[PDB]
Design a protein around this ligand. Structure first.
Ligand SMILES: Nc1ncnc2c1ncn2[C@@H]1O[C@H](COP(=O)(O)OP(=O)(O)OP(=O)(O)O)[C@@H](O)[C@H]1O
Lengths: 159, 594, 31
């Protein structure tokens, strides 16, 4: 896979911090960054920089609004919910989170979500101000190729 | 009630683990009420059940609270009242709920109605603008026969039980029960409760413009009365309810609606988009951010990140917005402890840009726009009968300006009515009127922000600098700072302007508003015997250099020269009037006067 | 009548106060 969709989904962010002091600064003078300083981190370096040490350099600070404030909101009613304004991609961000951290608690809570969300998208597939379409934003690859299945299958079935 | 009670019974054994964490909280709040009142020489009965703890291990007991919430609330009362005496009864009011949590897409903006969740739970936000009366109302009296010395007991139900459809009891005092005793009633042993009708508008920003703002109304109870000022971003959630008879009354009720939509609710929440809590950490950072000798200059340019310069203006706004103190004279008239600045400028020079972004960080200071109507600081006896026979003086725009700021535009472009209106309310802190009713001296601590334009084009240099707009100089005497915004052409100025309008199409604000709303509650020095010595030298020269220069000054301008430096020490957060404050107050006037 | 016309067992009557008004004859000679 030459990753046509997901490296931009890995272009997103994380707030995190340090454990040591490095003069490698590109973020602006005063090149040794003082430790325990909160820094915005892109996915690509920070996925492996929390691996290379024993004790790694960076500190994984969890964006716990993706862990407590919406985990009950997605527990309530998965028929109309913000999956979108908090994450332009909920999915692979949930995937690559759970590899490094490996928490089985929220590993259950999206397994209930996806069948319920797709329970709309099957039976909703028979045939606006600034952002407000976004309830239907992270579903585009998910159902639209199934929409062309039901479209043409009628067209052979009729005249 | 046999079969309609077993699931009520099964809940009574169920949710006792849900208040494993609240069975302390229900009793700890009332043991000191049994200790404050027993040792005088106070709280209502509020039991915040989180929706999570009920959702976490119950489904059928949970699903009914968001589908049919009409059989299920006096269950949770009935378990709650017997777990108060069984906790505490030995020392010799039903503990109704508050019911906070999340809801999962029931943020129905009342521009939209429901078609499916009628008579259900609903979360509603908006602004209130009605604020009707307060009036008690019985629930139960206690009759008494004087002969044979024995009491009686009777409850009278209304549209306040919220859920059951009771046969109404439209009796006021049923006297002469089945005996020959002239009945009495110990009204001190009776019990009472109050009502308050309030209508809520729509927050007029997320409602797309195809309609005016609509409104519905809510009836609340004793716990949360006198909590909502008119002009607060409130958030309420209660049941949905229709009442009244309609359509099938006795005759001739054609094309007449008969279902008054109401809300009987709980948990009125203010929001901010006074509640700003802060830990030891952030309160110590602002102590560490009180340390530098530059913070008055850093806070100036960290305010409006779109416009160049005007650092005399940019310091003046933050100096005004935090405000200065007024030591009221004991048996004497207090002076003008407010501060009221003014601007004027040749047009399209951002003189109106910075007047409206103060409203986002207003800290409950909602301003008007200055439309030519009487009602800027009055009522003019608007009563609307106050439900058939009562007269009230409903406040226009001074119940909101108290300890806040306002801003109005187009001063010269008004009629004569506002000119006499701002006359009294500036020299006097209050207003009093008997329009059709009674004189009443209601107070208001307010401060204006002005804006006006010169009439004769580009003439601010070729004529008198004074008498320039000819609105009455009583207001000019009652104001101090009259900035004249210059817009002369410098080839590096406009070149720098041309890029800063391009880099705006894509130390911070919430830390800034927390700083002032913490520094509004600390000490006030007022005293240094030599900082008062330098300023009178700093005035008497220009008191002899007032007519030999452009502007004449008055004696009340001396009360400015303390008041600016008074709040300037409030930026320092120190209990001492320093010396450095008598240098910023000098040159700020020196730009306003030269 | 029925329907909760029998009141509660109130420990505070007025006959226990009534005789404690009959004692307000001449006994308080101080004032
Ligand atoms: N001196 C200035 N520096 C930077 N930007 C400016 C300046 N004057 C105007 N602007 C730009 O003009 C826009 C709006 O100006 P504004 O409408 O506030 O003028 P105004 O104060 O209303 O004039 P008037 O009150 O005379 O109509 C803003 O987006 C602002 O960027």
């Amino acid at each position: 896979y030459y990753d046509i969709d997901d490296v931009l989904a890995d272009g997103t962010e994380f707030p995190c911090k340090f454990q040591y002091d490095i003069p490698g600064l590109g973020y602006n003078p005063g090149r040794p960054i003082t430790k325990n300083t909160k820094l915005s981190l892109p996915l690509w370096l920070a996925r492996i920089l929390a691996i290379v040490g024993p004790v790694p350099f960076v500190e994984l600070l969890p964006p716990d609004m993706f862990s407590t404030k919406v985990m009950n909101a997605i527990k309530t009613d998965p028929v109309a919910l913000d999956l979108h304004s908090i994450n332009s991609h909920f999915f692979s961000l949930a995937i690559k989170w759970i590899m490094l951290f490996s928490e089985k608690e929220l590993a259950n809570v999206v397994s209930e979500l996806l069948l319920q969300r797709a329970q709309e998208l099957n039976h909703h597939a028979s045939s606006t101000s600034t952002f407000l379409l976004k309830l239907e934003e992270m579903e585009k690859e998910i159902y639209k190729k199934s929409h062309e299945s039901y479209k043409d299958t009628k067209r052979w079935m009729f005249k | 009630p046999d079969a309609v009670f077993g699931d009520r019974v099964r809940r009574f054994q169920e949710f006792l683990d849900t208040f494993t964490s609240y069975r302390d909280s229900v009793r700890s709040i009332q043991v000191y009420n049994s200790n404050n009142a027993a040792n005088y020489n106070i709280l209502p009965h509020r039991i915040i059940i989180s929706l999570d703890d009920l959702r976490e291990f119950d489904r059928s007991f949970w699903s009914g609270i968001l589908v049919e919430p009409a059989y299920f609330i006096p269950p949770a009362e009935k378990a709650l009242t017997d777990l108060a005496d069984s906790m505490d009864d030995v020392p010799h009011h039903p503990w109704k709920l508050s019911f906070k949590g999340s809801f999962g897409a029931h943020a129905l903006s009342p521009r939209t109605l429901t078609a499916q969740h009628l008579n259900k739970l609903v979360s509603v936000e908006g602004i209130v603008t009605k604020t009707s009366l307060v009036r008690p109302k019985l629930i139960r009296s206690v009759h008494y026969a004087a002969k044979t010395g024995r009491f009686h007991y009777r409850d009278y139900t209304d549209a306040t039980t919220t859920l059951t459809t009771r046969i109404p009891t439209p009796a006021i005092y049923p006297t002469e029960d089945t005996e020959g005793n002239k009945l009495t009633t110990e009204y001190g042993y009776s019990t009472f409760i109050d009502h308050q009708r309030i209508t809520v508008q729509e927050m007029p920003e997320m409602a797309p413009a195809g309609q005016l703002p609509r409104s519905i109304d809510v009836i609340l109870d004793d716990d949360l009365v006198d909590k909502t000022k008119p002009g607060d971003r409130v958030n309420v959630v209660g049941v949905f309810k229709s009442l009244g008879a309609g359509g099938m009354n006795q005759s001739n009720s054609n094309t007449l609606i008969g279902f008054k939509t109401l809300i009987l609710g709980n948990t009125v929440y203010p929001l901010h988009a006074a509640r700003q809590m802060l830990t030891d950490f952030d309160i110590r950072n602002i102590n560490k951010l009180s340390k530098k000798k530059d913070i008055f200059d850093i806070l100036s340019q960290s305010l409006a990140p779109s416009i160049y310069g005007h650092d005399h203006i940019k310091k003046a706004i933050l100096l005004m917005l935090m405000g200065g103190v007024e030591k009221n004279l004991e048996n004497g008239s207090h002076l003008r402890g407010d501060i009221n600045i003014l601007m004027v400028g040749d047009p399209s020079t951002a003189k109106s840009q910075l007047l409206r972004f103060v409203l986002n960080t207003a800290s409950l200071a909602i301003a008007t726009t200055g439309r030519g109507s009487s009602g800027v600081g009055l009522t003019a006896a608007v009563t609307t009968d106050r439900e058939t026979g009562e007269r009230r003086l409903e406040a226009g725009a001074m119940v909101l300006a108290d300890r806040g700021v306002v801003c109005i535009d187009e001063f010269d472009k008004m009629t004569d009515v506002d000119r006499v209106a701002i006359h009294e309310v500036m020299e006097q802190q209050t207003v009093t009127i008997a329009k059709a009713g009674i004189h009443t001296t209601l107070n208001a601590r307010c401060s204006v922000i002005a804006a006006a334009n010169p009439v004769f084009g580009q003439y601010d240099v070729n004529r008198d600098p004074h008498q320039n707009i000819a609105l009455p100089d009583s207001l000019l005497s009652r104001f101090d700072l009259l900035f004249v915004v210059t817009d002369d052409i410098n080839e590096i100025r406009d070149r720098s302007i041309s890029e800063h309008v391009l880099r705006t199409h894509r130390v911070t604000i919430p830390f800034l508003r927390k700083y002032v709303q913490y520094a509004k509650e600390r000490v006030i020095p007022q005293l240094t015997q030599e900082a008062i010595n330098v300023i009178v030298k700093n005035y008497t020269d220009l008191r002899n250099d007032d007519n030999t220069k452009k502007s004449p000054i008055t004696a009340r301008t001396l009360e400015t020269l303390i008041r600016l430096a008074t709040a300037h020490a409030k930026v320092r957060l120190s209990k001492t009037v320093n010396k450095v404050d008598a240098k910023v107050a000098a040159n700020l006037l020196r730009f306003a006067l030269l | 009548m029925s329907a909760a016309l029998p009141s509660i067992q109130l420990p505070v009557d007025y006959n226990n106060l009534f005789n404690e008004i009959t004692d307000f004859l001449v006994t308080f000679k101080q004032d």
